[PDB]
Amino acid sequence: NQIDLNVTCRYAGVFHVEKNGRYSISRTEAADLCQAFNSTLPTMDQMKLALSKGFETCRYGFIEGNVVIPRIHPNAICAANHTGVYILVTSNTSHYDTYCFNASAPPEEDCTSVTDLPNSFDGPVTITIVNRDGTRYSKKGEYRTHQEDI
Numbered sequence: 760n761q762i763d764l765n766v767t768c769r770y771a772g773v774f775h776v777e778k779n780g781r782y783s784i785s786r787t788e789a790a791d792l793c794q795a796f797n798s799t800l801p802t803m804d805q806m807k808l809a810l811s812k813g814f815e816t817c818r819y820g821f822i823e824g825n826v827v828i829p830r831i832h833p834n835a836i837c838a839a840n841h842t843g844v845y846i847l848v849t850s851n852t853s854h855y856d857t858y859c860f861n862a863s864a865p866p867e868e869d870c871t872s873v874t875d876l877p878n879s880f881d882g883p884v885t886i887t888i889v890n891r892d893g894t895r896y897s898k899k900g901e902y903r904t905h906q907e908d909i
């Protein structure tokens with residue numbers, strides 16, 4: 760019973776979370792996952808400020824109200840060469856990665872590793888936070904509150 764959560768640098772408190780190395784998070788699980796990091800789904804304004812501080816990914820993820828990819832550099836295989844906060848318009852499917860926003864994080868780029876999952880609850884899952892530099896933090900718990908996400 761294990762969940763891997765790959766996380767990024769934070770940019771103005773915004774960061775990306777990928778579960779189990781695949782697009783696999785529903786919108787309800789995304790809100791619960793951010794809550795386990797004392798975080799919320801970013802607003803579009805919070806994501807735009809994070810982009811202006813240097814944040815970009817090549818993965819679709821939830822924010823409040825939309826599924827997006829923040830892009831700084833045009834790349835043909837990431838949001839079809841667009842820059843800015845690219846918004847997904849048409850898709851058949853419902854599972855993506857998520858973005859999260861922590862108001863207590865530093866105001867600009869924070870590329871230190873994540874070393875805690877502060878607001879997970881009691882549970883039986885081994886949850887492992889995996890940083891881009893490979894460093895890991897594991898704890899036994901749960902974060903999902905909706906049965907259909909388990």
Ligand SMILES: CC(C)c1ccc(CN2CCC(O)CC2)cc1
Binds near residue numbers: 880881882883
């Ligand atoms: C296998 C067993 C040890 C276990 C332990 C804990 C849970 C999650 N737990 C369930 C009840 C909820 O009110 C809160 C979270 C599930 C299963």
